[PDB]
Amino acid sequence: TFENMAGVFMLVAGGIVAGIFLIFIEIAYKRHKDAR
Amino acid sequence: DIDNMAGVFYMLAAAMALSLITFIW
Amino acid sequence: GMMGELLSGQADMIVAPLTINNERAQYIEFSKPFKYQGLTILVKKEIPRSFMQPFQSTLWLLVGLSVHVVAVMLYLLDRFSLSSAMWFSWGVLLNSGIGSFSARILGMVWAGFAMIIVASYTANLAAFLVLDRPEERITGINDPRLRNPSDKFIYATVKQSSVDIYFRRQVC
Amino acid sequence: ANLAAFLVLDRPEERITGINDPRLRNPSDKFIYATVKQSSVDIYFRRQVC
Amino acid sequence: FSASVWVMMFVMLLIVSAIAVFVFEYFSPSFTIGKAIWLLWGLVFNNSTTSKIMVSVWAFFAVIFLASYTANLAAFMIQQVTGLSDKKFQRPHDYSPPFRFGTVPNGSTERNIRNNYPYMHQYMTKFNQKGVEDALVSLKTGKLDAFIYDAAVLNYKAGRDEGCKLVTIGSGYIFATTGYGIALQKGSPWKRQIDLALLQFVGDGEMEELETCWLTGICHNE
Amino acid sequence: AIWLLWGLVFNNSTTSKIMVSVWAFFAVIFLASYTANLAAFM
Ligand SMILES: Nc1c2ccccc2[nH+]c2ccccc12
Ligand SMILES: *[C@@H]1O[C@H](CO)[C@@H](O)[C@H](O)[C@H]1NC(C)=O
Numbered sequence: 001t002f003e004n005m006a007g008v009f010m011l012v013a014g015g016i017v018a019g020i021f022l023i024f025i026e027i028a029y030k031r032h033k034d035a036r
Numbered sequence: 037d038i039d040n041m042a043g044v045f046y047m048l049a050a051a052m053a054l055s056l057i058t059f060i061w
Numbered sequence: 062g063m064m065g066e067l068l069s070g071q072a073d074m075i076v077a078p079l080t081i082n083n084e085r086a087q088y089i090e091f092s093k094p095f096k097y098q099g100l101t102i103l104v105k106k107e108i109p110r111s112f113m114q115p116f117q118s119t120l121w122l123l124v125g126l127s128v129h130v131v132a133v134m135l136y137l138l139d140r141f142s143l144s145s146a147m148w149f150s151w152g153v154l155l156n157s158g159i160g161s162f163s164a165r166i167l168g169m170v171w172a173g174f175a176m177i178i179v180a181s182y183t184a185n186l187a188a189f190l191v192l193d194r195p196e197e198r199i200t201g202i203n204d205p206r207l208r209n210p211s212d213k214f215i216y217a218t219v220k221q222s223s224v225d226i227y228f229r230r231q232v233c
Numbered sequence: 234a235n236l237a238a239f240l241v242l243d244r245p246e247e248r249i250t251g252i253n254d255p256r257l258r259n260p261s262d263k264f265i266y267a268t269v270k271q272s273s274v275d276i277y278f279r280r281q282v283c
Numbered sequence: 284f285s286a287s288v289w290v291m292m293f294v295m296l297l298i299v300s301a302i303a304v305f306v307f308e309y310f311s312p313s314f315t316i317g318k319a320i321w322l323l324w325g326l327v328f329n330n331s332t333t334s335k336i337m338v339s340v341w342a343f344f345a346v347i348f349l350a351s352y353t354a355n356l357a358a359f360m361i362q363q364v365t366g367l368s369d370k371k372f373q374r375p376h377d378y379s380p381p382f383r384f385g386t387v388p389n390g391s392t393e394r395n396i397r398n399n400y401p402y403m404h405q406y407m408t409k410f411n412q413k414g415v416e417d418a419l420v421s422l423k424t425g426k427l428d429a430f431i432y433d434a435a436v437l438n439y440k441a442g443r444d445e446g447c448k449l450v451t452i453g454s455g456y457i458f459a460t461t462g463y464g465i466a467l468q469k470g471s472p473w474k475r476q477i478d479l480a481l482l483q484f485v486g487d488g489e490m491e492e493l494e495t496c497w498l499t500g501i502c503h504n505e
Numbered sequence: 506a507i508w509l510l511w512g513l514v515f516n517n518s519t520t521s522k523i524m525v526s527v528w529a530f531f532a533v534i535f536l537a538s539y540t541a542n543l544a545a546f547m
Contacts, residue, residue, distance in 0.1 A: 019336065044177060047174060058162050061162070113347070154339065156330065157516070158517055158518045176515070183350045184543050186351060187354040188547050237360075237541040237544055238357075240545050
């Protein structure tokens with residue numbers, strides 16, 4: 001509807017994207033460290 | 037709200053009492 | 062103005078919206094009105110924008126630390142008598158269904174905490190949505206907000222029209 | 234939604250608001266109300282233009 | 284509530300679901316095709332490690348969205364002829380139940396409505412009454428469909444009607460927003476005083492109490 | 506028994522199956538009534 005929903009939806013989408021991007025490399029580095 | 041804080045902290049005492057009871061038993 | 066122009070002979074008939082007044086009728090006779098319509102108050106309409114994240118942050122920090130501390134302390138208690146612990150806590154937060162005596166009481170207290178926090182969140186959302194900024198800024202001449210001539214809210218008539226006469230013809 | 238609406242819109246105790254209340258104006262036989270005696274309520278009622 | 288924003292919310296849900304299923308498929312290093320959809324619906328629904336965190340936070344967002352939707356619905360749930368320009372009056376024969384209305388012979392309403400649509404006056408001549416009380420009785424007993432008369436008296440009767448079963452069609456739809464006035468005499472020297480007195484009374488506002496204690500429309504709902 | 510009893514009452518937690526299901530429905534009704542009462546109170 002108005003900004004009350006659009007803004008929070010955009011913030012949630014951006015947080016999802018950033019979290020996925022960070023967690024992918026974090027898990028990759030953690031697995032590399034565990035199995036070196 | 038201040039009332040909500042008190043309401044949510046009321047159950048914390050019961051939870052910690054149960055934790056102490058199950059730890060000592 | 063127009064009334065003086067009419068009285069001076071510069072006009073013979075006025076076809077325009079002209080409020081009927083006693084002072085005007087004392088010098089210029091009027092005809093039957095087209096329709097009856099009073100005067101109201103015009104105020105710009107604003108859409109509120111306030112979304113519950115900015116409402117509180119201290120409660121979010123408190124719950125975020127509380128979940129971790131209770132999870133670690135209860136896992137330590139269970140071990141006596143990590144990644145797996147935090148995964149289990151997140152799964153229970155998502156759905157209470159899982160997918161010696163310490164486990165039962167832990168589940169009961171955590172489900173009660175989740176229920177009370179979600180109920181409080183829903184109640185706050187509903188209250189703040191039904192009690193948002195209202196478009197009601199005035200109700201009439203007797204509205205208290207109209208009475209105070211505060212500099213914060215500035216409002217006045219456009220000219221010396223019938224509104225001015227009505228204001229001048231009031232006892233209070 | 235139905236539960237919430239029917240709970241917030243239940244029977245209200247508000248039956249009158251004053252002399253100008255429309256429900257007081259109608260002398261309908263369904264709602265019967267009168268003064269006890271000829272006290273000052275009667276004088277106030279008699280001393281009204283309408 | 285679902286006229287225009289429904290399409291936007293549906294397309295947003297579709298695109299976020301597509302993004303979620305794509306990233307879940309890319310999170311392969313059980314079956315992606317047979318578990319991603321189930322998990323996506325389960326997190327959104329109330330009772331249905333890279334993927335776990337995003338699934339949990341999206342479930343929390345879905346719970347927030349459901350709470351907001353319930354609050355919006357709660358806020359929302361708070362809250363026939365339309366004048367003479369309808370075909371019901373002009374064409375009563377097109378309907379199986381014949382239309383019947385009341386009027387006053389040797390009155391003013393019939394003389395006002397005979398000028399426009401004379402067929403309406405001819406039809407009304409068959410159905411005639413002799414008082415407002417007869418119209419009220421007919422409306423209470425259902426013997427009359429609608430009644431046409433002066434706006435003020437009709438509104439007063441509707442307000443004081445028992446059960447509020449008699450109402451008009453909106454407000455401000457009066458065909459001729461006329462008045463009553465004072466019947467003077469041709470050439471009488473009172474047009475210089477009566478009008479001034481009436482205007483002074485209107486300006487000073489001495490009619491509010493009269494209209495509150497003499498009209499007092501009971502049937503008011505909000 | 507305790508786990509099923511809590512699960513039916515909670516939102517997201519053949520003689521016994523029918524009674525458990527109907528009691529879960531009753532618990533949902535009770536939760537809805539409690540939420541409505543809180544909304545009226547606030
Ligand atoms: N005067 C009003 C109220 C007075 C007391 C309690 C609730 C009310 N709700 C209203 C809602 C709409 C208009 C007037 C309202
Ligand atoms: C006009 O008709 C009405 C019928 O309602 C009747 O009461 C009245 O006496 C009539 N007037 C004349 C002048 O015939």
